[PDB]
């Protein structure tokens, strides 16, 4: 239908004037409406193209020290991960993952701490033995050693857990 494929490609123009904001509102709604084309018609065109949008607005949202944008950023990327992985995009896409768990390390608060120790375990499994899984290892380090001064028993639990895994995933 004629109708269905201008009507995609209005939300596709949209949501590329929408990614050149550095508005994060503007950014994450550049990211709904690409991500609403990529339901309508995956493996098209239109489809791939609104990936590269997704990725832009991605890149722009994690270097916010805003929990929410970051959190936004990190589920953007790893959607083109899983779509586009014979594309270099995918491998951009981890970058802006890693990016985003970096930013949500330096926030004062174990909730984004244990979101980049969360989003930092996506890159080590989606690139096992890469240069890119061991910066993420550190990552997942450094938040758990700031896990570690948190009062709370349980904040406790998660850090020494993920410390845990860490060992038993690099070499002896």
């Known amino acids: 239908s004629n109708d269905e494929k201008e009507k995609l490609k209005?939300?596709?123009k949209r949501a590329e004037e929408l990614a050149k904001s550095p508005?994060?509102?503007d950014l994450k709604e550049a990211v709904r409406l690409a991500e609403?084309?990529?339901?309508?018609?995956?493996?098209?065109n239109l489809a791939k193209k609104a990936l590269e949008i997704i990725l832009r607005?991605?890149?722009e949202l994690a270097k916010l020290?805003?929990?929410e944008a970051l959190k936004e950023a990190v589920k953007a990327a790893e959607k083109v991960v899983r779509e586009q992985p014979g594309s270099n995009l995918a491998k951009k896409a981890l970058e802006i993952i890693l990016r985003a768990a970096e930013e949500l390390a330096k926030l004062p608060d174990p909730e984004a701490l244990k979101e980049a120790v969360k989003a930092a375990e996506?890159?080590?499994?989606?690139q096992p033995g890469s240069?890119?899984?061991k910066k993420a290892l550190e990552i997942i380090e450094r938040a758990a050693e700031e896990l570690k001064k948190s009062p709370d028993p349980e904040a406790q639990k998660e850090a020494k857990k993920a410390e845990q895994k860490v060992r038993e995933?690099?070499?002896?």
């Open 10 to 12: 209005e939300l596709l």
């Open 23 to 25: 508005d994060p509102e």
């Open 36 to 44: 609403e084309v990529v339901r309508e018609r995956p493996g098209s």
């Open 57 to 59: 607005a991605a890149e």
């Open 65 to 67: 020290p805003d929990p």
């Open 122 to 126: 996506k890159v080590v499994r989606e």
């Open 131 to 133: 240069e890119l899984a």
């Open 169 to 172: 995933e690099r070499p002896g």
